[PDB]
Amino acid sequence: MRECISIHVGQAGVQIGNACWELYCLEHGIQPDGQMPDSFNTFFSETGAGKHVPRAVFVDLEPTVIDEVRTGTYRQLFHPEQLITGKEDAANNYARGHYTIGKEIIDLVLDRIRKLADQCTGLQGFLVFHSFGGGTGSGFTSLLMERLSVDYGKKSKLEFSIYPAPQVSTAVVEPYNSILTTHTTLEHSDCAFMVDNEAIYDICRRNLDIERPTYTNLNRLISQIVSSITASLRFDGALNVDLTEFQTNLVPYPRIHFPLATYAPVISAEKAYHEQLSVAEITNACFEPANQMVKCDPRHGKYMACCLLYRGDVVPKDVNAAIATIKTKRSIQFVDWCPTGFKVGINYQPPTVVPGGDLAKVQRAVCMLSNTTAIAEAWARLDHKFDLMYAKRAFVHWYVGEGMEEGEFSEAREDMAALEKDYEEVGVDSV
Amino acid sequence: MRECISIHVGQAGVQIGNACWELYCLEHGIQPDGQMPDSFNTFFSETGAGKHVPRAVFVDLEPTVIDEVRTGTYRQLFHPEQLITGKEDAANNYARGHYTIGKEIIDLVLDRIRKLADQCTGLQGFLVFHSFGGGTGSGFTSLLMERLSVDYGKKSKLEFSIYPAPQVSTAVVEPYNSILTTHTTLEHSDCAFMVDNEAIYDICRRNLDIERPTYTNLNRLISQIVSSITASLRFDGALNVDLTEFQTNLVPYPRIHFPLATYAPVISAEKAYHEQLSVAEITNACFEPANQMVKCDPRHGKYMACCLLYRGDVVPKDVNAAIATIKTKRSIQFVDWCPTGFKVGINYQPPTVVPGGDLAKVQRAVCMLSNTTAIAEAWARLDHKFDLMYAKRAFVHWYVGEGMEEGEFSEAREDMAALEKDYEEVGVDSV
Amino acid sequence: MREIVHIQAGQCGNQIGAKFWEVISDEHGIDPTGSYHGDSDLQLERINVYYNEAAGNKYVPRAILVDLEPGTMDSVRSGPFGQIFRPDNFVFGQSGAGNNWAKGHYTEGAELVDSVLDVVRKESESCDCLQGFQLTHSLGGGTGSGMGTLLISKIREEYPDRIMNTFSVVPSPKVSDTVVEPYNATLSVHQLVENTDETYCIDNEALYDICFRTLKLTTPTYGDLNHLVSATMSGVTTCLRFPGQLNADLRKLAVNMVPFPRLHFFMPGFAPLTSRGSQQYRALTVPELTQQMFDAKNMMAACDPRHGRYLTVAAVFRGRMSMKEVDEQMLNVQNKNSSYFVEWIPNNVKTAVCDIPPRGLKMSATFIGNSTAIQELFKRISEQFTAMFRRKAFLHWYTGEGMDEMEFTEAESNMNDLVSEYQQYQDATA
Amino acid sequence: MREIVHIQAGQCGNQIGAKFWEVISDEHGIDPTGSYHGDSDLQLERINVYYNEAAGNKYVPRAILVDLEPGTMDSVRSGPFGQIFRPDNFVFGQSGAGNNWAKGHYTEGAELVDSVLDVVRKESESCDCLQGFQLTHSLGGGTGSGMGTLLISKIREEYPDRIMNTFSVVPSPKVSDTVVEPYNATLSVHQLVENTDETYCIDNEALYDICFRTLKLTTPTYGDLNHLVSATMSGVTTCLRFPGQLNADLRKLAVNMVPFPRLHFFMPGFAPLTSRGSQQYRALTVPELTQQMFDAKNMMAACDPRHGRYLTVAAVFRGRMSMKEVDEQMLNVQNKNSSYFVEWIPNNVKTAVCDIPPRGLKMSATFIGNSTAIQELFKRISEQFTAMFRRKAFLHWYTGEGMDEMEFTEAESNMNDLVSEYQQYQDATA
Ligand SMILES: Nc1nc2c(ncn2[C@@H]2O[C@H](COP(=O)(O)OP(=O)(O)OP(=O)(O)O)[C@@H](O)[C@H]2O)c(=O)[nH]1
Ligand SMILES: Nc1nc2c(ncn2[C@@H]2O[C@H](COP(=O)(O)OP(=O)(O)OP(=O)(O)O)[C@@H](O)[C@H]2O)c(=O)[nH]1
Ligand SMILES: Nc1nc2c(ncn2[C@@H]2O[C@H](COP(=O)(O)OP(=O)(O)O)[C@@H](O)[C@H]2O)c(=O)[nH]1
Ligand SMILES: Nc1nc2c(ncn2[C@@H]2O[C@H](COP(=O)(O)OP(=O)(O)O)[C@@H](O)[C@H]2O)c(=O)[nH]1
Ligand SMILES: [Mg+2]
Ligand SMILES: [Mg+2]
């Protein structure tokens, strides 16, 4: 009665969803054969007799990644018609992923989304996994978000975008794609969480004592976060939450809907025996400056709204006491115009342990979603990188050669500068 | 031959009447089944063969107390149509208990009263038990008194109102209810005896050596007083008395009919064996300053007329000697304009010991009904409480919203001021 | 010939009348069955004075009992002599006076009076020469004072030539039984003065003293007090019912004892009153009886005889005794105590002697004194009346039944005038 | 006779109502099967108040459950007492308010309110004489504070003469679980002031303090807090369901506790709160209960009683105890703490006694206080509202559902006026 739809776009989005769905199947007990050996009605359609099929759509212009899914251990799970593939990657070109190739495939995707929407009832919202740096994850997602807002204006959209790392870089045109997609998505997406590859690398190496991390470990952490967000839907507990509640609590202004994500109890098995992992200890970890999954200094900016999603055997009295201590810290600076900045959600189901993951079993777990002004530094950095390359007009001809206009680049820059100004204005205290 | 009718209105009235009828049944030898295994004709109608029925009408807007009576040990005694219950209680709202709801039950109550009156001859008068504090016992009592005075102008009405205690109170609108009911009933009742809960509590602690007295003992004492009052109508004896004699002797002026009841021989069993309980000692006890049933200082006001209702083996010479000794007392100051202070009534029947009562068997017993001017202090205290609460129209909107104007409050206040002035005037000596 | 009817009004009136008929029946030897069983023949010689013969030799008293409440009648009807009275005589009301004189004289008494007068006429025709009416009365109450006064006025109108005697209980000086006792007393005497022919004022306070001081009683009930009054009533009429060496009569008593029409209030007294323990230590003789009769403390009225000179004194002796001894005693009393008698009356003592003594006594006497000392009693009532009337206390009850302040003011004028008359002759000098 | 219809709205409302019906069924001995299995017929003597008889001796609660999300309804259904509720009463939406008051009062609540009102009428017209409505909701949330407010307005429009009681949970001062809690609270109270007749304020911080400091608990879940609130409601309503020496009523409490129309916010309290370890040490007596009730730290509201004088205080005792001790304790409280009451109210204590104590307790008392200290909570809420509203934080969500700034300003003005009235009455003297 509260079905939610998840859409995975681009290589990074598809791979994250692959780990994400591996988590859901383990949680509810759903076998890879999709034959459960209620709660699962919020994600899986009970098609046929004795079988469940997830409400997911996988779309990628390059057929390589999705072809790996069809050959993977989860072949029989997904609906074969739900996996849509192109025949040529966007090649990190935003125009190709939005204008040239994106036009050919968008019609088929909207057909699949409408099919799922009619099948489901009481639709909650959309989950979109995509990447800023890439072209398919940026150009196609902007195209998809523009379409859905027109067709589903009354429903909320949630994104989990791979925010570009400050020092670590993979594509030379990451600043270009990120600026373009943000301008085109700022007016459509209700609330988009951002995570950095670099920040997760430090967390993986430090807390988990992992010498050589890979994307498998990184994506599993993301899966744990998205599991916590949807926990209140897939399970019942004290003080439940809904996706519509996230939009209200975490978005003071329409143009500021970029909250961070954080998972507090991230420890290895070799270190779990000694740690107490108390509610107070867990909540302290969630606010650790080095424990944020975005490479930004939280102390260099005010907090505006933080949502805590506890999991497991957690007593609300412990949460109330732990919250009070956090509010009394002098370093943790909240905006004066927001007296109460905590939206607390609790659930009874503890996190499950991935058989191959590096995370040990924990009786309690929280996920912190904080809307903070610290990202103003992050926005400035990407904005600055955009300005340097565009000054020489480098790499512009590739975009121009696929239907773009040069003036559009300035407009995206102009809007991005406005966004940075808006963050600064909000960060100012009252008089 | 000499019929009398008892009407119990409100919770306090109903419970006191229950105790009084238990006392009457014990006194006349009438079993609770109504068949006793003349004297009884003054109160019970011998309807049918071998069955007697009390001449009582129980009225209460809240059906809880009357329902408890129906399920009580006296179920098969009262006539089923004699018990009249409303649907919603007055809830301490005088307007509700007089205007809004009383109009829906007054017709049935008057019909039952007319049936009882037509079923008897030589009707002496009416006995009404009610509380000055509650809503039903005030508004319904005033309405019923007005109706009876309209329809039975030649008869006498007697009330036993539970006057509010000075320092002890239970309802916040007790001053409002008391002032309103006094204003409405001062022109209809012929003589209204009054008692205070605080004074009876003090008597129970000091004399009975009881430290946790409930309402049962208080109601039993009140029943003893009522039985002493009505003894002359039920048993032969030297110097009998009647209710008309009470009205003639105890009411010097039309608006000064507020005597104080008093029961002299109130001792416990453990203390009875050490006292002779002679007539002189009993009479002296009846005038003890700390032995009145109303929390008023008798020495602060002149007596006007005191009626003594003796019981048991009493020699009239002892009564005359005790009266002379009382008249010789300087502290007991009578009004100089009433030389014949006392009205004396004797009866052969001694008091009866309640099986579970805390009073010990006594060979002699008297009841003192004194019309003293000290009651002006209590009237002034209640008037001051009313003035303080009404000074800012507190707790007024309830009365306003039930078809009652504000000017009635002012008229009642003026009438109470006039009553206090009349008491003060009467207090003045004669030249 | 010379038959006397008996009327009882009010609770006190009926209570006294019960014992009066008990003692009369004891004197005439009539059991509660109403059948004669006595031994002396002289008892039945004049039994028609109080009784009417009936079938089967049954005798019933010529008595009428009136009340406004059935409470007293039931006790009388259930008493030892309840079956003696004819049931038709038991006339009673329902509402009751409730000590309100106006209620007992104007409202409740107005309805019941016609029935009683019908019974009065029915009883009167049963005789041939009606001697006079006898009423037992209470001034303090409402039924007695109200109805009894109203009944007196009606009878006086119907029988102007016959004498009416009232034995009214007067309120005590110190002890008061009702709050409005002064009101009822003044209203009643307003009419008793101008209507009755001989009234024997009696006070409960004096009776209590006699029971205590003389009889040495510790628990004097109302039964004993009424017995003393009853003995007095029997002594007055014993001259009619029996022969004697010097026989008087009721009319012969009124002539001697009433110098003037307005002055007929008497203070009765009984001679042989002795306690049980002192019976053997005191000699029963004429001088012993005479000393007791003139004893100041022996008067059944609360007044002090020493405070006022006697106008006339009638002593009615009973039993066989020499006239010489009786006459000498009276001469000594009038000589030794000459300061206590009016000089303008040459001889004050009227003597009546009867042969048969009371039941069980060797001899006895009855004292009836017309003393001006009773003026003190009246002025006390007037004083109490005035204090309660200046502030108009309790007047709304009387005015509510049809009375008026005019009646009260008129009543006090009659009382003050009566007090003036008593003081006039008390100060009068030859 | 005198039936009460119970309405549960919002997640907190349903969570409280589950425990409320659990404890009520425990009192009346109604098993989760819905069939009576108790041992005291007095429970069934007044079971009509909360239940309707059915075929086969079945009884069902007269409850109506309202929500905008089916999760809470499904959780309740799986509960031990899910089967006793009539399934037709379960009314629930699909979209869910999502903590947005505007959505819970204009967009989702508007569509769903018709079914709720239809069920309300069906339940009400099935009773002979309706006593009043009771609502359990939360001010902080969206569904609660919007749907309950709209339903209260509709019912007040439909039933002007009845009384509506709301046991609303107020936001805690230091610990807040929602970001738009001040907005929701102000918008809800704007109508709660003008619509409801008696509102009981509950703060989770005070409940935590009671659970830890007094009850000596270490892991207090929401079950214990909801149980405390349910026990308070049962103590409030026990006067109707059982006899007693002084039986009160909901309207009786409304008349005794509300001096002026806009001041009807109370701070309830439960007297016998002791931990398991200290069960033997404390003596259970009326003075002990009275001392616990007036304890500063034992108030379920976050306000400090010492910061303002009470207007009126109602204490509803339960069990068999002497009235003398109760009134003596009340007099002692008014004497010692005379500085904590308004001088212009002579007597401030309303006392009710019932003969049926709560299950497992010899005696108990339920506290109800109309203290002026709630102005502190109101001004704290107003300050938070102003701080958020100066920069129009989160306003676009409300304006997206049809709301406007004018309503926010009007609600803030009404709250400020209420605070001003409270302060004025706290300040004014005789
Ligand atoms: N956290 C995480 N990040 C990934 C993963 N795979 C790729 N990325 C990051 O996502 C960014 C975007 O790369 P792609 O997703 O391949 O770009 P695209 O959407 O496929 O568009 P194309 O360039 O046409 O392939 C890269 O720079 C990577 O750093 C992954 O598995 N986990
Ligand atoms: N002495 C005595 N007083 C009682 C008793 N029961 C109640 N009262 C008094 O009655 C007062 C309250 O008035 P109630 O009679 O209860 O009210 P009511 O007449 O039923 O009208 P409502 O307020 O609508 O219930 C209290 O202040 C008590 O003092 C009792 O058993 N004995
Ligand atoms: N001697 C005597 N006096 C009585 C008796 N009963 C009543 N009294 C007197 O009568 C007075 C009461 O008046 P009462 O006749 O009863 O009032 P009534 O019935 O309205 O006429 C009291 O002052 C008593 O002193 C009695 O038995 N004997
Ligand atoms: N005492 C108590 N309070 C609760 C419980 N559950 C939720 N709450 C309160 O309700 C508030 C959440 O509002 P909620 O009703 O869930 O939002 P809504 O569904 O939109 O009305 C929080 O501030 C909690 O303090 C509970 O079980 N017990
Ligand atoms: Mg790709
Ligand atoms: Mg009542």
XYZ file of N, CA and C in Angstrom, chain C residues 309-379:
213
model
N -52.687 40.285 100.796
C -53.745 39.927 101.728
C -54.831 39.118 101.027
N -55.327 38.093 101.714
C -56.429 37.303 101.180
C -57.706 38.130 101.130
N -58.477 37.954 100.057
C -59.828 38.503 100.033
C -60.798 37.567 100.745
N -60.956 36.354 100.220
C -61.772 35.327 100.846
C -61.061 33.990 100.719
N -61.297 33.117 101.694
C -60.703 31.788 101.729
C -61.797 30.783 102.055
N -61.909 29.742 101.237
C -62.846 28.656 101.477
C -62.067 27.377 101.729
N -62.351 26.729 102.854
C -61.747 25.451 103.200
C -62.843 24.398 103.215
N -62.658 23.343 102.433
C -63.638 22.273 102.304
C -63.041 21.038 102.965
N -63.440 20.780 104.204
C -62.967 19.614 104.929
C -63.724 18.368 104.487
N -63.111 17.215 104.738
C -63.726 15.929 104.459
C -63.468 14.984 105.622
N -64.420 14.094 105.859
C -64.313 13.136 106.936
C -65.043 13.591 108.188
N -65.236 12.646 109.104
C -65.924 12.939 110.356
C -65.012 13.748 111.270
N -65.458 14.945 111.640
C -64.693 15.809 112.526
C -65.644 16.784 113.203
N -65.292 17.178 114.424
C -66.146 18.070 115.194
C -66.119 19.473 114.605
N -67.303 20.068 114.445
C -67.377 21.448 113.974
C -66.726 22.410 114.959
N -66.733 22.070 116.251
C -66.089 22.918 117.249
C -64.597 23.053 116.974
N -63.924 21.934 116.694
C -62.490 21.987 116.435
C -62.187 22.755 115.155
N -63.011 22.575 114.122
C -62.790 23.284 112.864
C -62.967 24.784 113.058
N -64.037 25.180 113.752
C -64.324 26.602 113.919
C -63.236 27.297 114.729
N -62.738 26.640 115.779
C -61.691 27.245 116.596
C -60.423 27.480 115.787
N -60.070 26.532 114.916
C -58.867 26.681 114.104
C -58.958 27.898 113.192
N -60.112 28.100 112.556
C -60.272 29.246 111.667
C -60.177 30.557 112.434
N -60.744 30.601 113.640
C -60.635 31.802 114.459
C -59.180 32.116 114.779
N -58.393 31.091 115.109
C -56.978 31.305 115.394
C -56.238 31.824 114.168
N -56.545 31.274 112.991
C -55.870 31.704 111.768
C -56.186 33.165 111.471
N -57.464 33.539 111.574
C -57.848 34.919 111.302
C -57.336 35.870 112.375
N -57.016 35.352 113.561
C -56.499 36.202 114.628
C -54.983 36.339 114.543
N -54.272 35.212 114.456
C -52.815 35.259 114.403
C -52.324 35.944 113.133
N -52.941 35.636 111.995
C -52.524 36.159 110.695
C -53.460 37.249 110.190
N -53.938 38.118 111.084
C -54.894 39.147 110.690
C -54.304 40.151 109.709
N -52.977 40.288 109.665
C -52.355 41.209 108.723
C -52.484 40.738 107.279
N -52.795 39.463 107.063
C -52.878 38.885 105.730
C -54.304 38.831 105.199
N -55.245 39.506 105.854
C -56.630 39.534 105.413
C -57.110 40.975 105.316
N -58.036 41.210 104.387
C -58.566 42.550 104.174
C -59.449 42.946 105.350
N -59.207 44.142 105.889
C -59.968 44.623 107.037
C -61.418 44.932 106.694
N -61.733 45.155 105.419
C -63.092 45.513 105.031
C -63.998 44.303 104.844
N -63.498 43.093 105.066
C -64.313 41.884 105.088
C -64.359 41.386 106.533
N -65.508 41.468 107.209
C -65.559 41.059 108.624
C -65.201 39.602 108.860
N -65.585 38.705 107.956
C -65.294 37.283 108.107
C -64.907 36.724 106.749
N -63.743 36.077 106.685
C -63.148 35.689 105.414
C -63.268 34.205 105.101
N -63.481 33.356 106.100
C -63.357 31.914 105.937
C -64.736 31.293 105.781
N -64.923 30.550 104.692
C -66.107 29.733 104.465
C -65.732 28.270 104.659
N -66.501 27.562 105.479
C -66.177 26.199 105.875
C -67.220 25.231 105.336
N -66.753 24.163 104.695
C -67.609 23.091 104.207
C -67.077 21.769 104.735
N -67.968 20.945 105.279
C -67.596 19.687 105.916
C -68.410 18.564 105.291
N -67.737 17.472 104.941
C -68.376 16.286 104.395
C -67.979 15.069 105.218
N -68.900 14.108 105.316
C -68.708 12.984 106.225
C -67.716 11.955 105.696
N -67.684 11.720 104.390
C -66.873 10.656 103.805
C -65.514 11.240 103.425
N -64.416 10.734 103.974
C -63.092 11.216 103.578
C -62.706 10.656 102.223
N -61.633 11.159 101.615
C -61.126 10.542 100.385
C -60.695 9.102 100.621
N -60.384 8.423 99.519
C -60.054 7.004 99.559
C -58.795 6.733 100.376
N -58.954 6.059 101.516
C -57.835 5.638 102.330
C -57.403 6.608 103.409
N -57.955 7.816 103.439
C -57.572 8.818 104.423
C -58.597 8.884 105.548
N -58.101 9.100 106.768
C -58.998 9.284 107.904
C -59.758 10.599 107.794
N -59.075 11.664 107.386
C -59.703 12.961 107.179
C -58.779 13.805 106.317
N -59.362 14.798 105.652
C -58.597 15.674 104.775
C -59.393 16.948 104.543
N -58.724 17.932 103.948
C -59.343 19.208 103.635
C -58.808 19.713 102.304
N -59.564 20.621 101.693
C -59.184 21.250 100.437
C -59.195 22.759 100.625
N -58.119 23.415 100.204
C -57.959 24.853 100.370
C -58.238 25.551 99.048
N -59.022 26.624 99.104
C -59.289 27.479 97.955
C -59.142 28.917 98.427
N -58.110 29.601 97.947
C -57.843 30.952 98.391
C -57.948 31.991 97.298
N -58.671 33.075 97.577
C -58.772 34.210 96.664
C -57.851 35.305 97.193
N -56.577 35.200 96.830
C -55.543 36.092 97.330
C -55.138 37.088 96.254
N -54.935 38.340 96.667
C -54.435 39.364 95.761
C -52.986 39.132 95.361
N -52.290 38.204 96.023
C -50.903 37.920 95.681
C -50.754 37.395 94.262
N -51.818 36.831 93.684
C -51.766 36.358 92.306
C -51.536 37.490 91.318
N -51.685 38.741 91.759
C -51.359 39.880 90.909
C -49.923 39.799 90.410
N -49.005 39.343 91.265
C -47.610 39.211 90.856
C -47.468 38.243 89.690
N -48.244 37.158 89.699
C -48.204 36.214 88.590
C -48.646 36.871 87.288
N -49.720 37.662 87.335
C -50.230 38.284 86.118
C -49.250 39.306 85.560
N -48.674 40.144 86.424
C -47.750 41.159 85.935
C -46.501 40.532 85.333
